[PDB]
Amino acid sequence: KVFERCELARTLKRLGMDGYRGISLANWMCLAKWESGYNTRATNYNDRSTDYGIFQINSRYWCNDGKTPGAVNACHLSCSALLQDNIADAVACAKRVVRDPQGIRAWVAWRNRCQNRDVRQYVQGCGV
């Protein structure tokens, strides 16, 4: 599913993402745009791991895709649950990811496209 901007924004607010571990909704939104373009089916293949879904969660430490060497499955979820039109499991696993010391900097794209920039644009006009 390819979410529209405010639609995705309303779902994340409802799922408790706003201000979670100090990460504003606008930042979660900025991360999702750059990582997947709001598409839940987004998949990126690297040599030894695959990134899944809307937040591009990695198969090495987070989900089990049954084909990754050294998999820890910290989210205790199959990676296929991160390619669902329903994003409740992805939000839940993304919350776990930022509980780690790196926080949202775990994603290089956030650092390069969102960090220290005006991200108000992602939620303006959404009533969120």
- Contact window for Na ion (CB under 5 A) among 25-33, 37-45, 71-79, 88-96: 71-79
**Rounded-to-integer distance, Cα 70 and Cα 60, Å:** 7
In what side-by-side order are the strands of the sheet with 50-52? Answer: 43-45, 50-52, 57-58
Q: Is 35 a catalytic residue?
A: yes
Q: Using the rule CB under 5 A, is 57 a contact of Na ion?
A: no
Nearer Cβ to Na ion (27/59) = 59
Q: Closest CB to Na ion belongs to which residue?
A: 71
3-state secondary structure of 20: strand
End-to-end CA distance of the chain: 21
Q: Using the rule CB under 5 A, is 87 a contact of Na ion?
A: no
Listed residue (127, 125, 51, 122) closest to 90, CA to CA: 51
The residue from 29, 30, 71, 123 that contacts Na ion (CB under 5 A) is 71
Q: Is 7 a catalytic residue?
A: no
User: Which of 35, 47, 89, 118 does the annotation list as catalytic?
Assistant: 35
Catalog residues that contact Na ion under the rule CB under 5 A. 64, 71, 73
